Amino acid sequence: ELQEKLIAVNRVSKTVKGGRIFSFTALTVVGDGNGRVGFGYGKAREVPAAIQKAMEKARRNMINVALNNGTLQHPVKGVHTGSRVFMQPASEGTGIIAGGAMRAVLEVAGVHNVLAKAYGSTNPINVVRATIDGLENMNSPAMVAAKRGKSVEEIL
RNA sequence: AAAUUGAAGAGUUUGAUCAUGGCUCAGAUUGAACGCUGGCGGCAGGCCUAACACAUGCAAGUCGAACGGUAACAGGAAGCAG
Ligand SMILES: [Mg+2]
């Protein structure tokens, strides 16, 4: 029912004639726990405002994910520029074995049993982007059946 | 019947950013040592260095059913003296 959680809040600076201008960026992630997950990156002069902006962004532009019984559909890799991510379905009771950002994104998405690792850069925004991309691309057996022109029973 | 149920990151370069890239940390372990402290038990372990030098005691004897035998001991026998 739209569970949301803020991964990282980071202070960034701009320089002007006067001096430095600080502002805050908030990376949040929302999801319905049934497949839908979406991340948002808001910027404002103060943290709460930034978070609100991020939340609105995340709530819009969500994406559907094919989940098989609260777990992944197959082992999937994902990249986004520096962040290359691996995530593998695991037996019921394994829990989310996943990094920071990754854990958040998976949890809001609704995966209950995963084995993840973040290779490459572990920059939260890029890592979240990578995970969402991987989750999105991951197809289900009904999808493969549709593509190949067979029944799901012939493929298994 | 069961005996692979298995994979987490963080700090640190920049006014800020992403990347590269090192350093550091979170875990487990030990024939450990040192500091402070210290009640009991169970089960293990205990010269990693000088294969350096070694006082002293012990760590390989046994068989008389292989053999001459009796140093003893322990006993009887024969000779005896009270
Ligand atoms: Mg030695």
Task: Give, in Å, how far the C1' of B22 lies from the CA of A55.
Answer: 37
Structure determination technique employed: cryo-EM
Cα–Cα distance for residue pair A44/A153, rounded to 1 Å = 52
Cα–Cα distance for residue pair A153/A134, rounded to 1 Å = 25
Task: Give, in Å, how far the C1' of B32 lies from the CA of A11.
Answer: 47
**A35 C-beta less than 7 Å away from strand B:** no
Reference A21, options A29, A11, A31, A30; nearest CA is A11
Cα–Cα distance for residue pair A14/A2, rounded to 1 Å = 34
Q: Nearest 5 degrees, angle CA A113-CA A114-CA A118?
A: 155
**A131 C-beta less than 7 Å away from strand B:** no
What letters, b where the CB count within 10 A reaches 16 and e where it falls short, cover A26-53? bbbbbbbbebbbbbbbbebeeeeebbeb
Residue with tokens 């002069």: A45
Instruction: Determine the longest span between alpha carbons in chain A, in angstroms.
Output: 70
DSSP string computed for chain A: --EEEEEEEEEEEEE-SSSEEEEEEEEEEEE-SSS-EEEEEEEESSHHHHHHHHHHHHHSS-B----SSSB-SS-EEEEETTEEEEEEE--TT--EE--HHHHHHHHHHT--BEEEEEEE---HHHHHHHHHHHHHH---HHHHHHHHTS-HHHH-
